[PDB]
């Protein structure tokens, strides 16, 4: 042995289970919801790669909370995870506006605070879970996997439930072309201390660059093309850089691979954030990934901010593109801006 004493070892991190929950209703590109949007064209739709997308229908009980409760309860039951065995719950929600607190705070309606984790832990009976609400916009699923992994590695949690819930439609200005790509959805994943080496987070790399912070914001403003006595709302806002996002996700992937001691040729499959086909392709070509090594999934879902990555991971697993034992890279960009990449050795992941 290397020493007479034994070396400490960080715990292996198992990605144990994943599920998503999407809106029941889908909206096509010629749906009347876009009737007040100017400057649309088939070239616009063909460019961004979205053919249909979902928006939560709160009148029918769909919102950022209710669909998470449904998905998390399903995943806990399917994965045979006792509620009291969850040590930490990490939630993200890119819209500042939340709308439902279940049976915990039943009289609260539209709200800025609190966020989700504490109320969700009470709703689900996660009596031992430390609740945390984190924000890294479209990279939040990766941030939460990184936070969970570090807690598990250092022996500070044995089971961590991760939630991303995107009610972006409550910030979209449907008098503006800025409303036409983003969409709603939810994802839930369970990470645990591994009992073997079949699964682990081999390395990750996160970095940020705020040079173009002002380009993509949430701003209190009137609609872009208002009618009548329009009121100010919090709206996604786009202000007027070409190579910035194309190059920085490969930078993050290269750093993560270097930290893992691997090259791109060692990677079986890639999972990317899904902002636009040209961007995914640029990221893939920047790291050496062939089209047979990743999926484009925004076509039928829209761009679900932080949920695009977990949805695409789930799709790849469900369709057999990603298999037990695979090494994968997950990577994306986020407004702010932020970039994240992770190199995983995957075992068996429960899709439920």
């Amino acid at each position: 042995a290397e020493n007479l004493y034994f070396q400490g070892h960080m715990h292996k991190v198992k990605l144990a289970a994943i599920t998503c929950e999407l809106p029941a209703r889908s909206y096509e590109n010629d749906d009347p919801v876009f009737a007040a949007v100017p400057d649309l064209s088939e070239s616009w739709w063909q460019f961004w790669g979205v053919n249909r997308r979902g928006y939560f229908d709160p009148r029918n009980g769909e919102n950022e909370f209710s669909l998470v409760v449904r998905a998390a309860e399903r995943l806990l039951r399917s994965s045979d995870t006792a509620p009291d065995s969850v040590d930490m719950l990490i939630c993200s929600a890119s819209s500042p506006i939340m709308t439902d607190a279940g049976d915990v705070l039943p009289d609260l309606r539209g709200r800025l605070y609190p966020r989700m984790a504490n109320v969700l832990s009470k709703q689900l009976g996660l009596s031992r879970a430390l609740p945390l609400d984190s924000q890294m916009e479209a990279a939040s699923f990766l941030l939460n996997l990184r936070l969970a992994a570090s807690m598990i590695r250092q022996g500070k949690a044995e089971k961590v439930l991760v939630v991303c819930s995107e009610y972006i439609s409550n910030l979209l200005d449907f008098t503006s072309r800025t409303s036409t790509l983003f969409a709603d959805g939810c994802a839930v994943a369970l990470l645990t201390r591994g009992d073997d080496d079949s699964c682990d987070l081999l390395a990750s790399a996160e970095h940020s660059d705020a040079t173009f912070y002002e380009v993509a914001t949430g701003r209190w403003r009137l609609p872009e093309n208002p009618t009548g006595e329009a009121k100010p709302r919090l709206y996604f806002s786009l202000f007027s850089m070409a190579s910035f996002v194309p190059t920085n996700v490969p930078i993050a992937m290269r750093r993560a691979l270097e930290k893992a001691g691997l090259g791109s040729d060692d990677i079986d499959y890639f999972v990317f954030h899904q902002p636009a086909p040209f961007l995914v392709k640029a990221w893939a070509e920047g790291i050496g990934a062939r089209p047979e090594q990743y999926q484009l999934t925004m076509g039928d879902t829209g761009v679900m901010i932080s949920v695009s990555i977990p949805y695409t991971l789930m799709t790849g697993l469900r369709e057999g593109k990603i298999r037990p034992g695979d090494r994968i890279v997950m990577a994306g960009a986020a407004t702010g801006w932020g970039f994240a990449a992770q190199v995983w050795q995957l075992g068996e992941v429960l899709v439920c």
Binding site: L112, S134, H207, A210, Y213, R221
Partner: protein, 278 residues
């Protein structure tokens, strides 16, 4: 988690609110915004520690304020760590936000992430410029405005506790919420309302919760947040910004370690993290 340096910058303007959860607290005026206080607080910490902005590995923010964050007072997102990175020139940093976390919980989580990733210089910042939130005039509850910067070196050794409030153990404490303003008419109107029901025993229950949690680490001296004026000199309190003077006193006294305790008004719990001190 080692605290290398502390920076703090508060408005000179204080406002008194009556009520059981009232007090005299710093309050931003006019269209003052958070960055005008956060940037000098951060630079004060970096200067004390002799750490250059380019050496910052990680910036984690905590700020509830829905507007008045930066030069464009109407921007709410992305959150203030990002424009902070830009104006500081922290060009190597990763930035994220821990939303409505307490500072103690954030420090514990960040110690864990940052030590795991091998970071050496981490900035955890807390601030408010809360003109966009209506105070709770029924209870007197308001947020303190200002900025606190903690420049930290992770160790992975910080310990953590989440504890109950004191007082009547059968008392169900009613939490803070910030509902959205449903009647925004002008861009400068309040965006939300602070709602923290008037609960006369809450300030003492928080202090009792602090004392109980401190008992888990009886060897340690400790610092705490004071969110309420009740029973404080002149009714004055600085919320989480109260921590700055206490941390600086600990440095003057050459303490090597201490316990830092936060009050989380959303969870109605207290949370403590153990720290090393420069």
């Amino acid at each position: 988690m080692l605290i290398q340096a502390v920076g703090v910058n508060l408005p000179p303007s204080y406002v008194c609110l009556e009520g059981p959860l009232g007090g005299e607290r710093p309050r931003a005026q006019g269209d003052e915004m958070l960055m005008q206080r956060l940037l000098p607080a951060v630079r004060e910490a970096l200067d004390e520690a002799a750490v250059k902005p380019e050496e910052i590995d990680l910036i984690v923010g905590l700020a509830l304020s829905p507007d008045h964050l930066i030069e464009n007072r109407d921007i709410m997102a992305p959150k203030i760590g990002h424009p902070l990175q830009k104006v500081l020139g922290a060009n190597r940093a990763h930035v994220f936000d821990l939303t409505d976390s307490s500072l103690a919980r954030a420090l514990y989580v960040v110690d864990t992430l940052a030590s795991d990733q091998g970071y050496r210089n981490v900035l955890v910042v807390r601030g408010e410029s809360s003109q966009g939130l209506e105070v709770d005039s029924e209870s007197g509850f308001a947020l303190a405005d200002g900025a606190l910067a903690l420049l930290c070196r992770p160790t992975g050794k910080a310990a953590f506790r989440r504890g109950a409030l004191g007082g009547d153990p059968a008392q169900e404490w009613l939490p803070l919420s910030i509902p959205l303003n449903t009647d925004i008419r002008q861009v400068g109107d309040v965006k939300g309302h602070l709602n923290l029901p008037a609960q006369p025993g809450l300030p003492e229950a928080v202090r009792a919760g602090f004392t109980r949690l401190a008992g888990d680490f009886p060897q340690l001296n400790w610092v705490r947040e004071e969110w309420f004026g009740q029973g404080r000199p002149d009714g004055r309190c600085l919320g989480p910004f109260e921590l700055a003077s206490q941390l600086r006193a600990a440095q003057r006294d050459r303490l090597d370690e201490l316990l830092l305790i936060s009050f989380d008004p959303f969870g109605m719990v207290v949370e403590g993290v153990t720290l090393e001190l420069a």
